[PDB]
Design a protein around this nucleic acid. Structure first.
Ligand SMILES: [Mg+2]
Ligand SMILES: [Zn+2]
Ligand SMILES: [Zn+2]
Lengths: 109, 87, 1270
DNA sequence: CGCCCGCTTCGGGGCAACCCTGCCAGTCTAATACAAATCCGGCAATGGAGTCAAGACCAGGTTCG
DNA sequence: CGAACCTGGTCTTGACTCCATTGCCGGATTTGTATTAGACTGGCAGGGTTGCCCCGAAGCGGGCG
């Protein structure tokens, strides 16, 4: 019960498109693992991050020898962990000896 | 598509810029320069009163008095009868 | 090449894109199936709308707002990651997805030839089993390991089968033990002799089923051993258990996978060189079916071999993403959102890819991962073409989703909807009315519509005249419509042409340019003479008004398309600004002569002089204003400013009969004097009765001999006098003015008695139903003609109905016969004739059953009209696309070839009887040779216009056949020359050097297809024309002779037989399957037995096949037969098309030849190539080792011809957009933008008319003498 | 001796006009526990940007003893 | 005749105001993940329609090794 008037979620300004001066800027050279190089022009006064998500789609590091060592998290949950939270070492060793005796009796009896 | 260009207000904006150039150039050099630096016409960022006092070799109070006197000047009908229809 | 698109292009190369190109286009990898945050309505990170990947939504703004103006441009925010720039790069940047398992492209798997199947030599039934995880495929195998483990594993097999037989005879021994136990427990006690052997029979059947099981597993072991011996690559293995047994026994010696990874491995282990060389060997030496299959394979294999392409791009390792501004998520007013139907397919692919990656990293059994991979494969196939394989993916409401190929296919694609025809600005639309006070070049215009058309012009003009301070108050002044804007509007309207469209636009004269003028009201007033060209009556038809802007388009509408410059028609060259209905009736009444009217010329004696003469037409007009003279009485005026006819000119003045002070007497009416005052000063005095054909001949002569402006002003004066004398004529209809014949009842009773006799004879069983139906049809047709005859003789001449008919204004005599007289026989829903027929006229009133009988044929014709109009539109659309690249390029090709023209065949008594169709077969052409006779002088020399005086000179000098020059034999490379095309029909002079004669010919052929009737087993209307231009083999396929000689006729059982005896040592050609519904050919009498026939004589009666008549008689006679057969359809309805409009389409048919020998240069046997390109390749191959590629000319229809063009852009825009585009990308075919449709698509200036380099680069400067005078 | 090539039949894909006029489609085990992340509400460091009052003062029109 | 004056500005100094602008901080809300123990084990599901044409594939009669 209205008029179909659409608008994309974003504004359109118009200022002076001058290219004679800009802000000064650096260029950081990022490198992924598979021999790729990438250039990302940051500004001058900009804290350049040691890692970066590259255009290729993989997390590339910075080519300067920073060596940040971010100390990543543990692998979340294993089947061994879900076994160990409900069993104990001696009971698992008991079932291990049970299956060892069964494979022995199947092998030579 | 409401985010497109209405294409009569753009050329009206261009003629408004030229009319404002004529009106600002009917005054002197210090007044027009202080006004354009104050409201940011030659550049994007408007220079503040301290910036214009730095670029003009004066204090900011002289800049502010010049600004007040020019804004009292520009509300004349002789400098308003052409710009009234632009709003 | 170019990437910023500066409109300086010369090529457009398509190609099959690899994964290395896909991940080079893309800016960031999309990895989440999200679009927009549900709460803040911002584009999500790493989604399908991500601002890091596709660019920013706001102008010069990052995502976190740290950089928000133009001074930070071209940099990247170190926190958010969005490169700060304009927001219009969301329309141009692409992303990509990295698939967890490869996927086959659907265009190269499911086509009408499957290209993967033709490349790898696999069946498509097998290919669908491979790539959809239904069957394994052996991708590789060993040779030497199989060679020695053949011996060792056959020893292993013999050992295993020995153990099998050991277990078998152990079961036999246990059966014997249990059998003796049954013997001991049966034959020692008291039991039945059958019951004591029941256990014996049970043990026997137990041994039989035990050895049945043993023999079945023996068959199993033999099967798996034989299959392992005969293992080979590209072999499918269905029956999963057999493959698992084969793998876990023989895990060496071979590998074998299932799916797109296995297809990628097969394309990896592949050489195109040895495969193509084996295929060349097979087409060299083989025969039959395998040669045809090897040709069909060699097409795609040589296509992959010739170019710098790789076959690995048919599988797909990374899908690309379209930019988000071409699939937007726009919100409406009020928060309602709208997706774009590709987001669901992209989200399904993203979901299933993430789930497959998680399943692989988690570690899952083979069933789940295989089902997930086939799910991802089905999702990507549904993305590229929904509804191709299996059930289409439906959304809400059971509607199939719009996939990527559906943006191109059909009528709703980009091509036929938004590329070729767009909505334009500066336009208008309103209804039309008749404007009979305007001049010819004018048109009316409502000011409320012209104020909106001319709004910026009037804005500038009323800013310039100080009626407004600036543009803003001027626009508000236009919106409030203040009373000075009209006074400005007249100034900005004057001398500014506008185009007036009428939809549908059938032909070239559907758009003409007028000068507007301000007219009150709201209707576009139109001149009453352009209604015939527009095909517009005033029953509520609307006409769209456009507007040129620049100086080039204004000069184009002022010069090329002005209404007073298009008088003649481009099809036949007859005038289309001729007086129509009321003007014809007015001029016919004004120029008819009544014997014995008021104040005639009676030559008297005794009482007085003659009292009929006059001094001058002024005195005649005064004596007609007084009630003495009627306009149509035979008087004798003395005329001074009207030029006499040729007889009286040579009689009185002799040579110098210049008029404007001379005097001569003329026995005419007053009306013909008043009519001849309209015509110009140089014209001789006509002195006839202005029938419509006489007015056609007068305007034809006056436009052939005089400048165009004189013709326009003469046509205007004729319209004025025609209307003014059409009112005073007194043509009115009253039911006392519709007279009935007096002897209608006697005629109807006399024919009714014979109808009673036929009905009585049918009642007495002397004849069947069909014969009495035919007898009644004949009787009542004769009665209809008799009643029409008596009605024709009963009427006077000044009856309004018979004057409207016989003056050629409108109508024909069948409509008057149905008004008064007898309606006649009425057709059926099937098309037969009901033997009832209606005896009541439409004046006496019909009755109930007769009305109900009439309604059958009425509704049938009314539906058939609309269906036929749609069909004719399709045929015109085909022809325009075929003939689009025939434009004039030179002035003279300087050839010496040329066709002949029959031109007034010899009478048997001995004269020159004129051929009827000389106006449509020999006028307006150029003499290819000279014309001479009796070893005398040349009458018409080489290269003349060949108009009517030269035709009369040829016929009077007594020659009959001339060799004329035409566009079938034009020897230019690209497009025809100018003297071959001859005179243009629309102008009268020679055709220009930029004309688009192909589109003119296609429009002139496909325009009058609506008016083509049809009939009650040969097609005789519009589908006859469609089967000719498509070059199908016809329905009534009549065989023709293949050699000279006599015939061996046989009247066989239910179908005949015809054999032709040659006059040489050849086998007698046999024609067997000739049905008894076909009749023999009659010529000069009907065909007999033993009759000596010619080479190209039609044996039966019907339609010969054009493919055979090319093979028998060469390419010359197939031009003659195709031109005559199309003309024979169009002239049946009385429609004239000149033959140069038909020879253009026939020339586009017979271009290419076929290849029957490869020679030694790159030409596959069976590939159709152009006559120019192939013959130039013979020039390159007579040097460097001489052998010719042998070729025979072929004739192909128009859909088959237009698709095999040189441009993949004009072909894909025409028809079958998928199947053209998929094999264009295989061969890496590069368009050159040289035709006529591609410049329309990409929006550059076309190479026709004012677009060519001769006319586009004209220097214009003032002359030096006029330079000094300023 | 079963093996395999000409005919026939069956099925899949494409197209079938052109002007206005139009305005939004569906549904079922349900919770706790917790933790991380984000936001928001409210003073607290300013501190710079502007506002105002007064005055020092250079020097050319303007009016008296 | 000189002389005050009065007033355009031109400019500075000093006090005052006032609102951005981070910065913690405490709490609120928002979002994501893990876990529920009687037994439960291979879909509902919806229609089949034209005409004409081209062409490619399946299958069958018919001879052949
Ligand atoms: Mg109409
Ligand atoms: Zn940011
Ligand atoms: Zn030529």
């Amino acid at each position: 019960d209205r008029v179909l008037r659409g608008s994309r979620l974003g504004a359109v300004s118009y200022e002076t498109d001058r290219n004679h001066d800009l802000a000064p800027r650096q260029i950081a050279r990022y490198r992924t693992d598979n021999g790729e190089e990438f250039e990302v022009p940051f500004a001058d006064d900009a804290e350049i991050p040691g890692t970066w998500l590259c255009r290729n789609g993989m997390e590339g590091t910075l080519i300067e020898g920073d060596l940040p060592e971010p100390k990543k998290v543990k692998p979340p949950r294993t089947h061994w962990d879900m076994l160990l939270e409900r069993r104990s070492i001696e009971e698992l060793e008991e079932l291990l000896k049970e299956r060892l005796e069964l494979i022995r009796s199947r092998r030579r009896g | 598509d409401s985010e497109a260009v209405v294409a009569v207000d753009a050329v009206s904006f261009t003629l408004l810029q030229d009319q404002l150039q004529s009106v600002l150039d009917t005054l002197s050099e210090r007044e027009a320069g202080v006004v354009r630096l104050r409201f940011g016409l030659t550049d994007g960022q408007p220079r503040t009163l301290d910036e214009i006092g730095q670029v003009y070799g004066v204090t900011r109070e002289r800049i502010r008095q010049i600004e007040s006197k020019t804004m009292s000047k520009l509300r004349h009908p002789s400098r308003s009868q052409v710009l009234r229809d632009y709003l | 090449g170019a990437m910023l698109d500066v409109n300086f292009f010369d090529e457009l190369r398509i190609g099959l894109a690899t994964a290395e190109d896909i991940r080079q286009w893309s800016y960031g990898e999309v990895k989440k199936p999200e679009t927009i945050n549900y709460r803040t309505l911002k584009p999500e990170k790493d989604g399908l709308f991500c601002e890091k990947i596709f660019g920013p939504t706001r102008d010069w703004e990052c995502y976190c707002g740290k950089y928000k103006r133009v001074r930070f441009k071209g940099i990247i925010c170190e926190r958010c990651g969005v490169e700060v720039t304009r927001a219009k790069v969301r329309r141009e940047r692409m992303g990509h997805i990295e698939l967890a398992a490869p996927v086959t492209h659907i265009w190269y798997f499911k086509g009408v030839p499957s290209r993967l199947g033709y490349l790898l030599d696999l069946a498509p039934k097998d290919l669908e089993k491979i790539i959809y995880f239904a069957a394994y495929v052996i991708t590789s195998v060993d040779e030497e390991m199989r060679h020695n483990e053949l011996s060792t594993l056959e020893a292993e097999m013999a050992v295993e089968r020995k153990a099998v037989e050991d277990q078998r005879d152990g079961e036999l021994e246990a059966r014997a033990q249990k059998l003796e136990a049954d013997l001991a427990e049966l034959e020692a006690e008291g039991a039945k002799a059958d019951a004591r052997r029941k256990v014996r029979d049970g043990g026997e059947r137990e041994m039989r089923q035990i050895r049945d099981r043993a023999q079945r597993e023996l068959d199993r072991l033999e099967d798996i051993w034989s299959t392992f011996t005969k293992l080979a690559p590209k072999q499918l293995i269905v029956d999963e258990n057999l493959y698992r047994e084969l793998v876990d026994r023989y895990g060496e010696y071979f590998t074998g996978a299932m799916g797109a990874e296995s297809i990628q491995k097969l394309i990896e282990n592949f050489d195109i060189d040895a495969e193509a060389e084996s295929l060349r060997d097979v087409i060299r030496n083989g025969k039959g079916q395998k040669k045809l299959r090897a040709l069909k394979r060699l097409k795609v294999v040589a296509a992959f071999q010739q170019s710098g392409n790789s076959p690995m791009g048919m599988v797909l390792d990374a899908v690309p993403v379209i930019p988000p501004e071409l699939r937007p998520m726009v919100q409406l007013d009020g928060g309602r959102f709208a997706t774009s139907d590709l987001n669901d397919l992209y989200r399904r692919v993203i979901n299933r890819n993430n789930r497959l990656k998680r399943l692989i990293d988690l570690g899952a059994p083979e069933i789940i991962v295989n089902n997930e991979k086939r799910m991802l494969q089905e999702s990507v196939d549904a993305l590229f073409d929904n509804g191709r394989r299996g059930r289409p993916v439906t959304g809400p409401g059971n509607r199939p989703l719009k996939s990527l190929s559906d943006l191109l296919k059909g009528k709703q694609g980009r091509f036929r909807q938004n590329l070729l025809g767009k909505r334009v600005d500066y336009s208008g639309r309103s209804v039309i009315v008749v404007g009979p006070q305007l001049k010819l070049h004018q048109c009316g215009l409502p000011k409320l519509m012209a104020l909106e058309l001319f709004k910026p012009f009037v804005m500038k003009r009323l800013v310039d005249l100080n009626h407004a301070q600036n543009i803003k108050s001027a626009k508000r002044m236009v919106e409030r419509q203040r009373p000075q804007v009209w006074d400005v509007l007249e100034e900005v309207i004057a001398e500014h042409p506008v185009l007036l469209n009428r939809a549908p636009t059938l032909h070239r004269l559907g758009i003409q340019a007028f000068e507007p003028m301000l007219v009150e009201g709201k209707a576009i007033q139109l001149h009453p003479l352009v209604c015939e060209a527009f095909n517009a009556d005033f029953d509520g038809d609307q006409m769209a008004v456009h507007l040129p802007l620049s100086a080039e388009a204004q000069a184009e509408a002022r010069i090329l398309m002005l209404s007073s410059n298009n008088i003649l028609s481009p099809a036949s060259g007859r005038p289309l600004a001729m007086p129509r209905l009321d003007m014809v009736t007015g001029l016919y009444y004004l120029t008819t002569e009544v014997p014995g009217d008021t104040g005639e010329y009676q030559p008297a004696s005794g009482d007085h002089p003659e009292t009929g003469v006059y001094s001058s037409p002024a005195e005649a007009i005064m004596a007609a204003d007084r009630g003495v003279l009627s306009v149509r009485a035979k008087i004798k005026v003395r005329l001074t400013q009207l030029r006499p006819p040729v007889e009286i000119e040579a009689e009185l003045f002799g040579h110098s009969g210049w008029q404007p002070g001379d005097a001569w007497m003329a026995e005419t009416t007053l009306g013909r004097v008043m009519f001849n005052e309209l015509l110009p000063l140089g014209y001789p005095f006509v002195n006839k009765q202005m029938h419509k054909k006489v007015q056609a001949a007068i305007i034809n002569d006056l436009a052939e001999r005089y400048p165009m402006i004189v013709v326009a002003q003469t046509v205007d004066k004729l319209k004025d006098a025609g209307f003014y004398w059409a009112t005073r004529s007194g043509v009115t209809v009253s039911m006392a003015d519709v007279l009935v014949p007096p002897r209608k009842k006697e005629i109807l009773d006399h024919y009714e008695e014979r109808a009673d006799k036929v009905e009585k004879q049918f009642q007495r069983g002397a004849l069947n139903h069909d014969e009495r139906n035919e007898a009644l049809v004949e009787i009542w047709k004769e009665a209809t003609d008799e009643v029409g005859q008596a009605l024709r003789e009963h009427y006077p001449d000044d009856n309004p109905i018979i004057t409207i008919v016989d003056s050629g204004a409108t109508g024909n005599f069948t409509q008057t016969r149905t008004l008064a007289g007898m309606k006649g026989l009425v057709t059926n829903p099937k098309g037969e004739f009901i033997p009832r027929p209606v005896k009541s006229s439409f004046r006496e009133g019909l009755t109930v059953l007769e009305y109900f009988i009439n309604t059958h044929g009425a509704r049938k014709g009314l539906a058939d009209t609309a269906l036929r109009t749609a069909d004719s539109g399709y045929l015109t659309r085909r022809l325009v696309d075929v003939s689009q690249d025939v434009i004039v390029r030179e002035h003279d090709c300087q050839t010496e070839r040329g066709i002949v023209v029959e031109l007034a065949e010899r009478a048997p008594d001995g004269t020159l009887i004129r051929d009827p169709y000389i106006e449509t077969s020999a006028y307006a052409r150029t003499l290819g040779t000279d014309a001479v006779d009796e070893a005398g002088n040349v009458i018409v020399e080489r290269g003349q216009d060949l108009g009517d005086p030269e035709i009369d000179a040829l016929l009077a000098a007594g020659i009959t056949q001339v060799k004329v020059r035409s566009v079938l034999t034009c020897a230019t490379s690209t497009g025809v020359c100018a003297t071959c095309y001859g005179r243009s029909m629309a102008t009268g002079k020679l055709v220009d050097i930029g004309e688009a004669v192909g589109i003119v010919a296609a429009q002139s052929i496909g325009e009058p297809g609506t008016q083509l009737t049809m009939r009650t087993d040969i097609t005789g209307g519009l589908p006859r024309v469609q089967e000719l231009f498509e070059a199908r083999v016809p329905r009534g396929k009549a065989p023709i002779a293949d050699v000279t000689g006599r015939v061996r006729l046989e009247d066989g059982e239910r179908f005949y037989k015809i054999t032709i005896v040659p006059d040489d040592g050849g086998e007698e050609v046999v024609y067997d399957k000739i049905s008894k519904r076909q009749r023999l050919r009659v010529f000069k009498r009907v065909l007999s037995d033993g009759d000596h026939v010619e080479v190209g004589q039609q044996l039966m009666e019907g339609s010969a096949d054009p493919h055979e008549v090319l093979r028998v008689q060469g390419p010359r006679e197939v031009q003659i037969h195709l031109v005559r057969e199309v003309q024979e359809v169009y002239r049946a309805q009385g429609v004239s098309i000149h033959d140069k409009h038909i020879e253009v389409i026939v020339r586009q048919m017979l271009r290419r030849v076929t290849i029957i020998d490869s020679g030694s240069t790159e030409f596959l046997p069976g590939s159709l190539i152009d006559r120019a390109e192939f013959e130039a390749e013979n020039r390159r191959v007579v040097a460097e080792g001489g052998e010719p590629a042998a070729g025979r000319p072929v004739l192909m229809g128009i859909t088959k011809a237009s698709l095999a063009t040189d441009s993949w852009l004009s072909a894909a825009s025409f028809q079958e957009t998928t199947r053209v585009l998929t094999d264009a990308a295989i061969n890496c075919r590069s368009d050159k933008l040289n035709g006529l449709k591609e410049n329309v698509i990409i929006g550059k200036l076309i190479p026709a008319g004012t677009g060519i380099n001769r006319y586009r680069n004209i220097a214009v400067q003032p002359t030096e003498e006029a330079r000094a005078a300023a």
